[PDB]
Amino acid sequence: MKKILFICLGNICRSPMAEFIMKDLVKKANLEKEFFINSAGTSGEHDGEGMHYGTKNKLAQLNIEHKNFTSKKLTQKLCDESDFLITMDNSNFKNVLKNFTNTQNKVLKITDFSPSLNYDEVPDPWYSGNFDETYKILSLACKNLLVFLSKHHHHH
């Protein structure tokens, strides 16, 4: 029963796109062993729509406009379910830290993975200034994230 909880500030850009990407590849070595994944925002204020200039445009190029419309809101009860927690957002990290108990130690940051990415909170031109930005960020982040998420540690 392995559960991965992904947290996205807006959850209306990098959350939906990556949601489809991960869900696709996981079928290889995750859906087989019956794995579960969930993406939610910080306060679920709006995090759930799934639409942004950078991400949508990127998907329009070849991918799908969107297919993860689900208003989510990462909370304590939800976090208690997932075995692993991920932020990726620079600010969401500090916030989620003091927002939750000492169990935040199960959270991961993309700042440790991403090398010359040095991205802010979610790609797209509204946060960076380019649509292709979503390409480099999501593709790279999801890739490395998939590696560690695909059991790249030691069990016990």
Domains of the chain with bracketed CATH: 1-156 (3.40.50.2300)
- Residue 10 to residue 31: CA distance in whole angstroms: 26
Contact assessment for residue 124 and residue 53, using Cβ atoms and an 8 Å cutoff: yes
How many CB atoms are closer than 10 A to CB 106?
Answer: 13
Q: Which of 44, 72, 66 minimizes the C-alpha distance to 134?
A: 66
For residue 13, indicate whether it is catalytic.
no
Q: Which of 86, 3, 94, 96 minimizes the C-alpha distance to 44?
A: 96
Which DSSP helix (H) or strand (E) runs through 39?
strand 36-40
Which residue among 14, 47, 79, 89 is the active-site one?
14
Helix (H, G, I), strand (E, B) or coil at 12: coil
- Residue 92 to residue 5: CA distance in whole angstroms: 14
For residue 120, indicate whether it is catalytic.
no
CA distances from 137 to 51, 121, 149 (A): 16, 11, 17
How many CB atoms are closer than 10 A to CB 92?
Answer: 23
For residue 89, indicate whether it is catalytic.
no
Determined by which method? NMR
Contact assessment for residue 43 and residue 73, using Cβ atoms and an 8 Å cutoff: yes
Contact assessment for residue 128 and residue 54, using Cβ atoms and an 8 Å cutoff: yes
Which residue among 8, 13, 79, 142 is the active-site one?
8
- Give the residue carrying structure tokens 């031109």: 125
Which residue among 13, 47, 89, 124 is the active-site one?
124
Strand partners, 86: 6, 108
What 63-69 contacts at long range (C-beta under 8 Å, 24+ apart), as own/partner pairs, is 63/17, 63/20, 64/20, 66/16, 66/17, 67/16, 67/20, 68/15, 68/16, 68/17, 68/19, 68/20, 68/39, 69/16
> Which tokens in the block code for residue 13?
């850009």
- Residue 128 to residue 137: CA distance in whole angstroms: 11
- How many helices (H) and strands (E) the chain has is answered by 6, 4
